[PDB]
Amino acid sequence: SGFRKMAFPSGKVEGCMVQVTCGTTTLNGLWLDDVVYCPRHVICTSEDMLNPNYEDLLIRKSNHNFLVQAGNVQLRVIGHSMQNCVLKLKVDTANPKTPKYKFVRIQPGQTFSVLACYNGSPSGVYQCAMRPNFTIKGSFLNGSCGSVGFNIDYDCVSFCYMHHMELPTGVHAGTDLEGNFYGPFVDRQTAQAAGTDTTITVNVLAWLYAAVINGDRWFLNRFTTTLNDFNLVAMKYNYEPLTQDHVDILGPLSAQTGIAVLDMCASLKELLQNGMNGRTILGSALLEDEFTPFDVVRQCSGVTF
Amino acid sequence: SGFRKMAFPSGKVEGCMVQVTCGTTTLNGLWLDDVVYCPRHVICTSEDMLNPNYEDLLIRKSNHNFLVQAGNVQLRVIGHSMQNCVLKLKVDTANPKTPKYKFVRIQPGQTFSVLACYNGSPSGVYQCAMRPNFTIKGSFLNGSCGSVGFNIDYDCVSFCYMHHMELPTGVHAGTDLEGNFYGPFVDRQTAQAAGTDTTITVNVLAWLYAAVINGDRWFLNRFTTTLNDFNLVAMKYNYEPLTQDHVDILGPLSAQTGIAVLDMCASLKELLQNGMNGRTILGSALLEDEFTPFDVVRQCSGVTF
Ligand SMILES: *[C@@H](CC(=O)OCC)[C@H](C[C@@H]1CCNC1=O)NC(=O)[C@@H](CC(=O)[C@@H](NC(=O)c1cc(C)on1)C(C)C)Cc1ccc(F)cc1
Ligand SMILES: *[C@@H](CC(=O)OCC)[C@H](C[C@@H]1CCNC1=O)NC(=O)[C@@H](CC(=O)[C@@H](NC(=O)c1cc(C)on1)C(C)C)Cc1ccc(F)cc1
């Protein structure tokens, strides 16, 4: 029993992290087969942060202007292309540690693991969720760009995030591995507003099911409610609306417990309206929303990789 | 910016995880060089399970009764012995992925990363604290025994925990890698009482300092107090006493923020007396106590390994 914010094993991704340096700019890169992926910002010459001419700057920089270091092994760059906001460096050696991988674009509410890296070396791993406003609440410092986020689908490392920027609110923004930002952000020091953050309702319910599986049922009542009666309440507290698609995704946890989705919504409606009575749920005094229904099932089953 | 429950990179440990099988009983082992370490209770049956004479059970076992498998290759046990609650199986093959390692016994309040495994394969990684009552609040299912906990101290994987049992409260107990349990627990199904748990005061203060480093200052007050006055309040709220050694340990965070330790103690004193005002600190509505001062500096300064 027990339920923790659990990250994926980071070994497979650790073997892909390298240090990319261009001029004075140094950051992290992802080395898969003979291609190294990093944020294109590495070629900016400081002044370019505002209005970078990436077209003239890629033309400007030679292959020799890029240093790639896999630990203490220098990788020879033989090509440099740009895909949206990601710079792609072709190197003369294929990474033997390359795992079975895919590039995936995740949706808001889905979780992933982040391997925070600096100078091509790992510092730690933690779980994140793509917020409804396409930011992430991570832990990134200067030098952290190029760090990636990922899931492990069975035996395939699904890369879904590369880190680029930090907003003034202390949250973070980045791209998929094709260079396309999540949300309406651009890798430049310009004006950019993140929408209102909302609570990921489908995830809160999954977490309440996890609580029930692990023997926390004090929030359970005998009431029930309709899908639209619950959303009337949720929308007032910046909770994203619940749909039948979310109810279906919760079926597996509904089954394991015998508690219908709409009976748990009624219990959640109560917690949304009148707080938590100074009690806790799986060690928290707030409604946790960064656990997907899948995360709960795999945690309460022991799914290995 | 940002502060997350951050685990160490698990790569070095993933490469040491193997599957140990004695009869029908299968669990996880740690393969360092030419020896596999695992819980001795793999030799038991459920008949012996109760108050087993382990010395009599090992005697009855041979090397051939132990099947060890690293991924898809099988290792040959060429010797078996027992040190406290840990079973050492000398194997004919030495692990090439063995990191520079050390077996360490951690103090209460210290943290470590847990690599939850099943059938010799990792499932996830998360942070744990050795509670003052020598339990840990983990996430473990059947077949998780043998999973280990660790810190990375610069260039050395310091193994500090091997998982054994779940108590009726939902908490967990285990040993160091020398086979010696943390706390008064035994690897048997016999009466075992965990003491009344307490909050790790020094860690709460470190987490409040992390909040200040990350901009959350709403809880700071202009007051300071004595170490006895603070401890008078603390004892009432089930907080372990604060010692001068903990004050010194917090020096670097006080030194970095400009807030004296006893100044922060008065801020915590008022949070305990009057509550958190329905607010959150670093995304929690509770006072978090599973971040050591080092953990705070680790994540706030970008340590790598
Ligand atoms: C990553 C930069 C890096 O690793 O390169 C080292 C040479 C860095 C991440 C942030 C640093 C502080 N905490 C972070 O998460 N990104 C940057 O430095 C970019 C600039 C910023 O992100 C600033 N924030 C904004 O510009 C901003 C403002 C708004 C409204 O939205 N975004 C932070 C410094 C505060 C520039 C950069 C440099 C190199 C890259 F590879 C990508 C992006
Ligand atoms: C691990 C056993 C395993 O890996 O499978 C081998 C076939 C398992 C993990 C615990 C159960 C689930 N969560 C856990 O942490 N441990 C056990 O099965 C041990 C039995 C128990 O822990 C029981 N609890 C007690 O006996 C107990 C009683 C008191 C007063 O305090 N604790 C729970 C299952 C109810 C037995 C075991 C088996 C094999 C080992 F290598 C070590 C320990």
Swiss-Prot record, chains A, B:
Full-sequence range covered: 3264 to 3568 of 7096
Reactions that this protein is recorded to catalyse: TSAVLQ-|-SGFRK-NH2 and SGVTFQ-|-GKFKK the two peptides corresponding to the two self-cleavage sites of the SARS 3C-like proteinase are the two most reactive peptide substrates. The enzyme exhibits a strong preference for substrates containing Gln at P1 position and Leu at P2 position
Active site: 41 (for 3cl-pro activity), 145 (nucleophile)
Subcellular location, record wording: Host cytoplasm; Host Golgi apparatus; Host nucleus
Cross-link (Glycyl lysine isopeptide (Lys-Gly) (interchain with G-Cter in ubiquitin)): 5, 90
Cytoplasmic topological intervals: 1-305
Effect of mutating residue 205 to V: In strain: Zeta/P.2
Activity regulation text: Inhibited by pyridone-containing alpha-ketoamides compounds 13a and 13b. In turn, alpha-ketoamide 13b (tert-butyl (1-((S)-1-(((S)-4-(benzylamino)-3,4-dioxo-1-((S)-2-oxopyrrolidin-3-yl)butan-2-yl)amino)-3-cyclopropyl-1-oxopropan-2-yl)-2-oxo-1,2-dihydropyridin-3-yl)carbamate) inhibits SARS-CoV-2 replication in human lung cells. Inhibited ex vivo by michael acceptor inhibitor N3. Inhibited ex vivo by compound 11a and 11b.
Domain of life: Viruses
Gene that specifies this protein: rep
Protein name: 3C-like proteinase nsp5
Purpose of the protein: Cleaves the C-terminus of replicase polyprotein at 11 sites. Recognizes substrates containing the core sequence [ILMVF]-Q-|-[SGACN]. Cleaves and inactivates human TRMT1, preventing tRNA guanine(26)-dimethylation of tRNAs. May cleave human NLRP1 in lung epithelial cells, thereby activating the NLRP1 inflammasome pathway. May cleave human GSDMD, triggering alternative GSDME-mediated epithelial cell death upon activation of the NLRP1 inflammasome, which may enhance the release interleukins 1B, 6, 16 and 18. Also able to bind an ADP-ribose-1''-phosphate (ADRP).
